[PDB]
Design a binder for this molecule. Structure first.
Ligand SMILES: O=C(CCCCCCC(=O)Nc1ccccc1)NO
Ligand SMILES: [K+]
Ligand SMILES: [K+]
Ligand SMILES: [Zn+2]
Length: 365
């Protein structure tokens, strides 16, 4: 079964309108198209999420508020601050249709996996992992990752969420904090002052979900080899302990060298090794994007990872296409790490891995 690629011209145009990542969806799609990768995938038009689908996670009061301020773009509603709207998540006109489109696209990908249409379904414009049931957060108005997991739960009894974004996947972790049917694994920068502030290795979930949240706090400057070593170690133990039946994988590209966040120092090759490790489990896998604020590098990264999913080696030269002039100064697909130090002490990393190994001993059946 060829991978499913969630795409429509109207969906990309809607995603392009997000003020924090303008035209990023067009750049990702047009680069993948220029490498001719869409011909090797099953292109599926996303459905827009219904109110009832979004309310599987979000409260009706939040959804109705988002719908109301979306009408005229009311960025001064008295209740908006209560719902997390205003600064990182402004109440712009049409944002509810934007949110419902991204939520629906991830649900559509999940439904493709349930129906056996494919073993891999891709929504690069998804991955908005910070939104809470009743609150926008960190550029995220709707938590499409949670919506996709809840759709997968119609069929799959154990779902593994893996979050390789620079930031802690707090909204997804919190949504499933109290359950053992969904295990969340997040690798992220963890440093006092760095958003969202949560996700220490000691954060393991709560109640019946205790030990079914895994957090790998990492410092500035990590590069491909050490990151893969960490990721493989954790995922090997998680797979043995939890035996997931489906995977949701968030691949935010704000870890990549050259991102204005200027924190990690990864290239798509290292992220791609993590992706390959998950793919060889041969489980139903839902692929999401996320952060990524060097727009050309984010397109480079997700195009390369689409190649990985397809088992294809891509030419190093960026093909001639609409956004070719954005790929300077070198106009190649490869990304060179910055000449910055790796702040990850090997013994602290090993201590973190030791803690996680101990936690996963408690994970039973
Ligand atoms: O990538 C993300 C979204 C990050 C949400 C924003 C965090 C706060 C922040 O970095 N704000 C900021 C960034 C650049 C310039 C000014 C403020 N989540 O994974
Ligand atoms: K993460
Ligand atoms: K959990
Ligand atoms: Zn991020």
């Amino acid at each position: 079964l060829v991978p499913v690629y969630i795409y429509s011209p109207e969906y990309v145009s809607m995603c392009d309108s997000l003020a924090k990542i303008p035209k990023r969806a067009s750049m990702v799609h047009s680069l993948t198209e220029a490498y001719a990768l869409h011909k090797q995938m099953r292109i599926v038009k996303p459905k827009v999420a219904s109110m009832e689908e979004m309310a599987t996670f979000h409260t009706d009061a939040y959804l109705q508020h988002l719908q109301k301020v979306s009408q005229e773009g009311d960025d001064d509603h008295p209740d908006s601050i209560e719902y997390g709207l205003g600064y990182d998540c402004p109440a712009t006109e049409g944002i509810f249709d934007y949110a419902a489109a991204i939520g629906g696209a991830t649900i559509t990908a999940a439904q493709c996996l349930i129906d056996g249409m494919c073993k891999v379904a891709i929504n690069w414009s998804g991955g908005w992992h910070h939104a809470k049931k009743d609150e926008a957060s960190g550029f995220c108005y709707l938590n499409d990752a949670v919506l996709g997991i809840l759709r997968l739960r119609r069929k799959f009894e154990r779902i593994l969420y893996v979050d390789l974004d620079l930031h802690h996947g707090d909204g997804v972790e919190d949504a499933f904090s109290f359950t053992s049917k969904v295990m969340t694994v997040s690798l992220h920068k963890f440093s006092p002052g760095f958003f969202p502030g949560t996700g220490d290795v000691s954060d393991v979930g709560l109640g019946k979900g205790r030990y079914y949240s895994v957090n790998v706090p990492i410092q500035d400057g990590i590069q491909d080899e050490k990151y893969y070593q960490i990721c493989e170690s954790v995922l090997k133990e998680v797979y043995q302990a939890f035996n997931p039946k489906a995977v949701v994988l968030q691949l935010g590209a704000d870890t990549i060298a050259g991102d204005p966040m200027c924190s990690f120092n990864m290239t798509p090759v290292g992220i791609g090794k993590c992706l390959k490790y998950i793919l060889q489990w041969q489980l139903a896998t839902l692929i999401l994007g996320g952060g990524g604020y060097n727009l050309a590098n984010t397109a480079r990264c997700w195009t390369y990872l689409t190649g990985v999913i397809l088992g294809k080696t891509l030419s190093s030269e960026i093909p001639d296409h609409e956004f070719f002039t954005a790929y300077g100064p070198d106009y190649v697909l490869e990304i060179t790490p910055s000449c910055r130090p790796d702040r990850n002490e090997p013994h602290r990393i090993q201590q973190i891995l030791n803690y996680i190994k101990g936690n996963l001993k408690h994970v039973v059946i």
